[PDB]
Design a protein around this nucleic acid. Structure first.
Ligand SMILES: [Mg+2]
Ligand SMILES: [Mg+2]
Ligand SMILES: [Mg+2]
Ligand SMILES: [Mg+2]
Ligand SMILES: [Mg+2]
Ligand SMILES: [Mg+2]
Ligand SMILES: [Mg+2]
Ligand SMILES: [Mg+2]
Ligand SMILES: [Mg+2]
Ligand SMILES: [Mg+2]
Ligand SMILES: [Mg+2]
Ligand SMILES: [Mg+2]
Ligand SMILES: [Mg+2]
Ligand SMILES: [Mg+2]
Ligand SMILES: [Mg+2]
Ligand SMILES: [Mg+2]
Ligand SMILES: [Mg+2]
Ligand SMILES: [Zn+2]
Lengths: 60, 176, 214, 37, 146
RNA sequence: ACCUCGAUGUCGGCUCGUCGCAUCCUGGGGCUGGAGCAGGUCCCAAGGGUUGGGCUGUUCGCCCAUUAAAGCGGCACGCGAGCUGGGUUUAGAACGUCGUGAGACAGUUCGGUCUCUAUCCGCCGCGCGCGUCAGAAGCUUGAGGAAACCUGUCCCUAGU
RNA sequence: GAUAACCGCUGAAAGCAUCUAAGCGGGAAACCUCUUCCAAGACCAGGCUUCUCACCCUCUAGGAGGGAUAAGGCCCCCCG
């Protein structure tokens, strides 16, 4: 959550976007990326945000 | 609403300056300052009148609208003519006399009562029993006149004490 | 401003008024003081005058204490105390090195006197707090001077803070207010104060102009 | 002053008002003066 | 194994928050986050990796409603009938910083670590602070959209 | 009839208190079928104060002198590892009454062992240690606490 | 000083009226100050000052360990 919010995304939308992109990295390793490789974590945030719906608050 | 809709006449001898929400009105008696509530809007009919207007028919705007029209109307009426409250004394030995800026009364207490005039108000005694208060600000004139009105407890039996000029107090008879 | 001086309680005696009424008086040796330091709002955050009193051999004064007297340019004294002043105009009336004497007061002035009360040692509740104690007879078993109950029961199941109990009594800072100065003796440097003042004879006291009746 | 849970206009000159969150009846007759409480 | 801070690992920074016109509770929650170190990916609950927070203009804090007169700070001296109360209005006039201080402290954990975290909070009534030597970073209270 | 019957001692008094306000006095007010004095009723108010005796084990109550007033309640009907032990409620004895009797009586009467060296919390006092970024000393600020807070009569104003 | 009950001033919503909705004031032994005392173990452990402001050794050259001192203090001693 701290690393996500430093990349301008909330945790809940990050997890949603990673699921939609089909990225199956679990939270143990996502946290290890957040600490040990901020660049790789940032790239994952971009992937997640791209896969998010256009209007997250729209039906469906 | 029905009160705030009515423009305020500005006589040709009265100077009105409007600066956003600040209002300053200058006249023969002096200068007076007023501030309108943020929502209410105060404009000026170039013809020579003041218009008070409101954004919305919401309750708060409705109430502040009528308020602000009468406040500025009082402000104009003050710098034109001034406010005067006539007051009268009843009862034997009850007396008033003027001592400089201060007014002194003898309402049957062991000590006399001294009231200092706050800034912007003045006292005039036409008789030992009849006097007046005058000033530019209607609220200040009213305030001092009320304090003087309360100098004695209400006396519904003998009618003593300070009154307004037209004042019709409540009366009763203590027949014992 | 609030005058004051340091002095020693000499003892009590009796004088007569001009209308022949008797006046009990305590004699205070309002000995010469010297202004050793001035406290200012700009240096210290408050206004006060520091006074020094009582003769002392320079053999006895410790070196850091001597250093402070030396910086003031005055000979060391045994007792140093501050008088707190309300304002800086009052401070302006004092200068370092200046001497103060009993004559700062005039007859009929009202003073407050501060001193240390006599020590009473470990005192029982009857003496220390005025407890009534219990009966001397009618069966009372070994409780003649005991304090009795010290609390309720299960609720609150404890003794409240402030519960009056036995313990050390006396040796406290005490200020007696609104004492009349009967006479000022400029030749002996003495104040005759009507009434009692705290402390044993030979003890340090501070005489100030009364706050309430000044 | 009457202080009661129920406050009613006692005569046709009594006016019910709310002041500082209290219901009050004000009137020219000081007997009818009353406050909810 | 999950990353654990070591001896040299924690790096502090200095933040300054202007409390002027900010809601008390909003300011306090944000400051508590920074002091606790929740914004850092290295956060560990048994470690204080928080940053230093300076609050300025703590007298200009905003409170809504009638809380200025009806909210009471309570204190008990431990003596019978030793309960004293002040309104937030009165407390803001006498001890401006205490209002903000109490709000933030009540949002920190009530344990030993929390007391150590409180060391890093500095609050000032005026617009100025003595810590220009630490070059505090202006911190604005933002909301990440979702 | 939910805790306690391998034990949570009772009424009244004494000592020491602490809290509530539904306020007895003192303080501030509205309305009166309040002329004045003196009241009636309702609102606000818990800072302080709120007597000594006769009778009874008594609480309660009645009474005698006072007072500004002689408040009502909670805290194991506060307080017996703090005191008392008159009442009640062991064993003795007696009267009335009931029982064939042994006996019995919120009927009465006279008498009748009140144990404990304070470990812990708590409270009143007093030291030792270490800390407050060198070792020391004088004088201090006051965050925060504690204490105190009662009231009468007479004389002027005015016999107005 | 800020208030309680209470008294109000200036005023709309609601052409009137209203102590109130915007604003501005009086008002008690209760409250905050004020009076007396404690108080920096107030861990944000404060402030203004003054004094001493100095030296040897060992481990390895890091940090420590030991010994002797200064200002000052304690114990012993004569006492309150
Ligand atoms: Mg015995
Ligand atoms: Mg005995
Ligand atoms: Mg059952
Ligand atoms: Mg057992
Ligand atoms: Mg009440
Ligand atoms: Mg008080
Ligand atoms: Mg009991
Ligand atoms: Mg017991
Ligand atoms: Mg028997
Ligand atoms: Mg028979
Ligand atoms: Mg016998
Ligand atoms: Mg018996
Ligand atoms: Mg018996
Ligand atoms: Mg304090
Ligand atoms: Mg404390
Ligand atoms: Mg210090
Ligand atoms: Mg010793
Ligand atoms: Zn009516």
């Amino acid at each position: 959550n701290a690393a996500a919010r430093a990349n301008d995304i909330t945790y809940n939308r990050l997890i949603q976007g990673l699921k939609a992109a089909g990225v199956e990295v679990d939270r143990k390793n996502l946290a290890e990326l957040a600490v040990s490789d901020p660049a790789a974590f940032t790239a994952l945030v971009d992937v997640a945000r791209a896969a998010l719906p256009e209007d997250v608050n729209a039906p469906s | 609403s029905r009160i705030g809709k009515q423009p305020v006449p500005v006589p040709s001898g009265v100077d009105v300056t409007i600066n956003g929400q600040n209002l300053s009105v200058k006249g023969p008696k002096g200068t007076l300052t007023l501030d309108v509530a943020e929502p209410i809007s105060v404009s000026r009919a170039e013809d020579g009148a003041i218009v008070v207007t409101r954004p919305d028919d919401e309750r708060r705007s409705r109430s502040l609208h009528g308020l602000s029209r009468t406040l500025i109307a009082n402000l104009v009426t003050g710098v034109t003519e001034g406010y005067t409250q006539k007051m009268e004394i009843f009862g034997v030995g009850y007396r008033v006399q003027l001592k400089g800026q201060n007014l002194e009364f003898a309402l049957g207490y062991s000590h006399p009562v001294l009231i200092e005039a706050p800034e912007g108000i003045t006292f005039a005694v036409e008789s030992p029993t009849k006097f007046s208060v005058s000033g530019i600000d209607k609220q200040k004139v009213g305030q001092i006149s009320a304090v003087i009105r309360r100098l004695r407890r209400p006396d519904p039996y003998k009618g003593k004490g300070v009154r307004y000029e037209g004042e019709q107090i409540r009366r009763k008879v203590g027949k014992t | 401003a609030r005058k004051g001086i340091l002095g020693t309680k000499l003892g009590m005696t009796q004088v007569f008024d001009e209308n022949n009424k008797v006046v009990p008086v305590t004699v205070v040796k309002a000995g010469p003081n010297v202004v050793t330091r001035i406290r200012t709002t700009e240096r210290d955050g408050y206004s006060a005058v520091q006074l020094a009193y009582g003769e002392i051999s320079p053999r006895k004064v410790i070196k850091p204490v001597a250093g402070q007297f030396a910086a003031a340019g005055v000979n060391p004294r045994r007792h140093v105390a501050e008088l707190r002043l309300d304002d800086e105009a009052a401070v302006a009336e004092y200068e370092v090195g200046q001497e103060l004497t009993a004559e700062i007061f005039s007859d009929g002035a009202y003073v407050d006197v501060t001193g240390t009360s006599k020590g009473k040692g470990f005192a029982g509740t009857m003496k220390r707090h005025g407890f009534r104690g219990q009966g001397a007879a009618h069966g009372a078993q070994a409780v003649h001077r005991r304090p009795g109950s010290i609390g309720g029961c299960a609720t609150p199941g404890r003794v409240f803070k402030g519960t009056r109990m036995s313990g050390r009594m006396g040796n406290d800072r005490v200020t007696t207010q609104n004492l009349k100065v009967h006479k000022v003796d400029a030749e002996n440097g003495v104040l005759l104060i009507k009434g009692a003042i705290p402390g044993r004879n030979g003890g340090l006291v501070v005489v100030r102009s009364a706050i309430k009746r000044g | 002053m009457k202080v009661n849970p129920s406050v009613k206009p006692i005569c046709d000159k009594c006016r019910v008002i709310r002041r500082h969150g209290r219901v009050m009846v004000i009137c020219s007759d000081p007997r009818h003066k009353q406050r909810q409480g | 194994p999950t990353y654990t801070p070591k001896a040299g690992d924690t790096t502090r920074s200095w933040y300054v928050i202007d409390a002027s016109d900010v809601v008390l509770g909003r300011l306090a929650s944000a400051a508590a986050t920074l002091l606790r170190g929740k914004h850092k990916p290295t956060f560990t609950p048994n470690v204080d990796g928080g940053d230093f927070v300076i609050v300025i203009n703590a007298d200009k804090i905003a409170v809504s409603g009638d809380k200025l007169t009806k909210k009471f700070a309570y204190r008990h001296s431990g003596y019978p009938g030793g309960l004293r109360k002040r309104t937030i209005g009165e407390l803001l006039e006498k001890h401006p910083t205490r209002v903000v201080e109490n709000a933030i402290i009540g949002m920190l954990p009530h344990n030993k670590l929390g007391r150590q975290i409180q060391k890093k909070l500095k609050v000032y009534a005026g617009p100025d602070h003595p810590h220009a030597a630490q070059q505090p970073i202006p911190f604005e209270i933002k909301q990440v959209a979702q």
